[PDB]
Write an enzyme that holds these catalytic residues in place. Structure first.
Site, mmCIF file in Angstrom:
data_model
loop_
_atom_site.group_PDB
_atom_site.id
_atom_site.type_symbol
_atom_site.label_atom_id
_atom_site.label_comp_id
_atom_site.label_asym_id
_atom_site.label_seq_id
_atom_site.Cartn_x
_atom_site.Cartn_y
_atom_site.Cartn_z
ATOM 1 N N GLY A 62 0.790 -1.225 0.000
ATOM 2 C CA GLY A 62 0.000 0.000 0.000
ATOM 3 C C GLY A 62 0.823 1.276 0.000
ATOM 4 O O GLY A 62 1.415 1.645 1.022
ATOM 5 N N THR A 63 0.861 1.955 -1.167
ATOM 6 C CA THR A 63 1.455 3.284 -1.331
ATOM 7 C C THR A 63 0.352 4.359 -1.347
ATOM 8 O O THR A 63 -0.643 4.231 -2.072
ATOM 9 C CB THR A 63 2.445 3.349 -2.538
ATOM 10 O OG1 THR A 63 3.087 4.628 -2.567
ATOM 11 C CG2 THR A 63 1.789 3.058 -3.900
ATOM 12 N N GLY A 64 0.544 5.387 -0.527
ATOM 13 C CA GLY A 64 -0.258 6.604 -0.554
ATOM 14 C C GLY A 64 0.570 7.795 -0.997
ATOM 15 O O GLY A 64 1.795 7.799 -0.819
ATOM 16 N N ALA A 68 2.075 8.553 2.555
ATOM 17 C CA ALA A 68 2.846 7.512 3.237
ATOM 18 C C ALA A 68 2.644 6.154 2.547
ATOM 19 O O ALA A 68 1.508 5.785 2.221
ATOM 20 C CB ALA A 68 2.431 7.423 4.700
ATOM 21 N N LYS A 69 3.754 5.425 2.319
ATOM 22 C CA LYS A 69 3.749 4.044 1.825
ATOM 23 C C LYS A 69 4.150 3.071 2.931
ATOM 24 O O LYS A 69 4.885 3.445 3.842
ATOM 25 C CB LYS A 69 4.624 3.864 0.570
ATOM 26 C CG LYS A 69 6.073 4.341 0.689
ATOM 27 C CD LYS A 69 6.968 3.817 -0.443
ATOM 28 C CE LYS A 69 6.944 4.647 -1.709
ATOM 29 N NZ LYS A 69 5.865 4.227 -2.645
ATOM 30 N N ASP A 98 -10.805 10.252 13.786
ATOM 31 C CA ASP A 98 -10.914 9.665 12.451
ATOM 32 C C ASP A 98 -11.132 8.152 12.521
ATOM 33 O O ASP A 98 -10.185 7.381 12.384
ATOM 34 C CB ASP A 98 -9.702 10.014 11.571
ATOM 35 C CG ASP A 98 -9.985 9.772 10.108
ATOM 36 O OD1 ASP A 98 -9.778 8.632 9.648
ATOM 37 O OD2 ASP A 98 -10.470 10.708 9.435
ATOM 38 N N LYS A 118 5.940 2.186 7.879
ATOM 39 C CA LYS A 118 5.325 3.341 7.231
ATOM 40 C C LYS A 118 6.433 4.332 6.918
ATOM 41 O O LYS A 118 7.164 4.747 7.816
ATOM 42 C CB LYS A 118 4.220 3.971 8.103
ATOM 43 C CG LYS A 118 3.143 4.701 7.290
ATOM 44 C CD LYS A 118 1.980 5.212 8.144
ATOM 45 C CE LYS A 118 1.033 4.116 8.597
ATOM 46 N NZ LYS A 118 0.067 3.708 7.535
HETATM 47 O O1 LIG Z 1 1.347 -5.265 8.571
HETATM 48 C C1 LIG Z 1 0.543 -4.545 7.978
HETATM 49 N N1 LIG Z 1 -0.216 -4.983 6.943
HETATM 50 C C2 LIG Z 1 -0.103 -6.180 6.197
HETATM 51 C C3 LIG Z 1 0.908 -7.103 6.432
HETATM 52 C C4 LIG Z 1 0.991 -8.255 5.673
HETATM 53 C C5 LIG Z 1 0.068 -8.502 4.659
HETATM 54 C C6 LIG Z 1 -0.949 -7.578 4.415
HETATM 55 C C7 LIG Z 1 -1.024 -6.421 5.188
HETATM 56 C C8 LIG Z 1 -1.970 -7.824 3.332
HETATM 57 N N2 LIG Z 1 -1.563 -8.862 2.379
HETATM 58 C C9 LIG Z 1 -1.104 -10.064 3.087
HETATM 59 C C10 LIG Z 1 0.178 -9.768 3.848
HETATM 60 C C11 LIG Z 1 0.349 -3.114 8.378
HETATM 61 C C12 LIG Z 1 0.458 -2.753 9.717
HETATM 62 C C13 LIG Z 1 0.289 -1.434 10.098
HETATM 63 C C14 LIG Z 1 0.011 -0.503 9.136
HETATM 64 F F1 LIG Z 1 -0.164 0.794 9.518
HETATM 65 C C15 LIG Z 1 -0.100 -0.816 7.813
HETATM 66 C C16 LIG Z 1 0.072 -2.134 7.427
#
Ligand SMILES: O=C(Nc1ccc2c(c1)CNCC2)c1ccc(F)cc1
Length: 313
Positions: A13-15, A18-19, A127, A35
């Site tokens: 996830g890229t924004g 913040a990515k 939020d 992040k």
């Molecule tokens: O760990 C995170 N997400 C995450 C991790 C692993 C996977 C995913 C999301 C989704 N696809 C499968 C593997 C995460 C944790 C905190 C955050 F702010 C943003 C993302």
């Protein structure tokens, strides 16, 4: 660069803000999310993030996504955060279309818990939206981006019209909107033009699907009162009839993992590693700088909780 305390993996996830990059803490062997903020892109909202980060240093709860490490380079800010494999609540609803009453209840009880804790610590999220609600491998909710555009749908009517608002009465409105989208799979107030969106929020009138139970409709109308005086209080929400409809206990908002004292085994392993004594190691930890030591401690704590040996490589 410089954060080779970590091996870097996938991008998740890229924004345009913040990515998020997946990572592995070298010492602990523990999986982490990073992040990556750019200070150039932030600019007139860097103290916005610094205050967000400073709140996040004082919050330790089971349904709040844990902060491990902050790293600030010439132009970049790195937040090292709890790994949440399960995904987003938003993407979880759109895939199921909507959740059962019984499942929304299970999930909702978690939001309430996280939010009540936050309030007791003298903060309001300001939020709450499904994009801020991640799932771990055990499908438990973790709350993110405490920051405070398309949060206008989740915005309280008194928040809209720049009136004197309480942060908890707003947090309650938000949870009403979230409760609606959980059970329905669509927003209660939603429009293409944002002025007409603002109109519907003030009007307070919303659609009620046939599948909604009376207790649901009844809790919804308690939660989406336009007038904040009329809105259901956080106190009354913790032990609400609907909230207790399946599991007949009030919400356990109290931190189940408080920061109390330092863990002995973690301190002894960090003492052997950093080649200094227990007391000098304890003092160094208790400083809580959110440097590599804070990350190593908190990730050794994680390792211990899994029943894995409390050891660095
Ligand atoms: O760990 C995170 N997400 C995450 C991790 C692993 C996977 C995913 C999301 C989704 N696809 C499968 C593997 C995460 C944790 C905190 C955050 F702010 C943003 C993302």
């Amino acid at each position: 660069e410089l954060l080779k305390y970590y091996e870097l993996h996938e991008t998740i996830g890229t924004g345009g803000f913040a990515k998020v990059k997946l990572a592995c803490h070298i010492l602990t062997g523990e999986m982490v999310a990073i992040k990556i903020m750019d200070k150039n892109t932030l600019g007139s909202d860097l103290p916005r993030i610094k205050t967000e980060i400073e709140a996040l240093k004082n919050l330790r709860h089971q349904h709040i996504c844990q902060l491990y490490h902050v790293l600030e380079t010439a132009n970049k800010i790195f937040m090292v955060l709890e790994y949440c494999p399960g995904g987003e609540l938003f993407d979880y609803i759109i895939s199921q279309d909507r959740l059962s009453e019984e499942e929304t209840r299970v999930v909702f009880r978690q939001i309430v818990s996280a939010v009540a804790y936050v309030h007791s610590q003298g903060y309001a999220h300001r939020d709450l939206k499904p994009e801020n609600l991640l799932f771990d491998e055990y499908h438990k909710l973790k709350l993110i981006d405490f920051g405070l555009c398309g949060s206008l749908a989740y915005a309280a009517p008194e928040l809209i019209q720049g009136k004197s608002y309480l942060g908890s009465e707003a947090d309650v409105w938000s949870m009403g909107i979230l409760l609606y989208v959980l059970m329905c799979g669509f927003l209660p107030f939603d429009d293409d033009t944002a002025a007409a969106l603002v109109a519907k929020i003030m009007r307070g009138k919303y659609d009620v699907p046939k599948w909604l139970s009376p207790s649901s409709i009844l809790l919804l109308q308690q939660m989406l009162q336009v007038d904040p005086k009329k809105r259901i209080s956080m106190k009354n929400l913790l032990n609400h009839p609907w909230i207790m409809q399946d599991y007949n206990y009030p919400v356990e908002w109290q931190s189940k993992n408080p920061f109390i004292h330092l863990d002995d085994d973690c301190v002894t392993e960090l003492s052997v590693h950093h080649r200094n004594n227990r007391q000098t190691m304890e003092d160094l930890i208790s400083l809580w700088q959110y440097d590599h030591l804070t990350a190593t401690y908190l990730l050794l704590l994680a390792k211990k909780a899994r029943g894995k040996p409390v050891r660095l490589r």
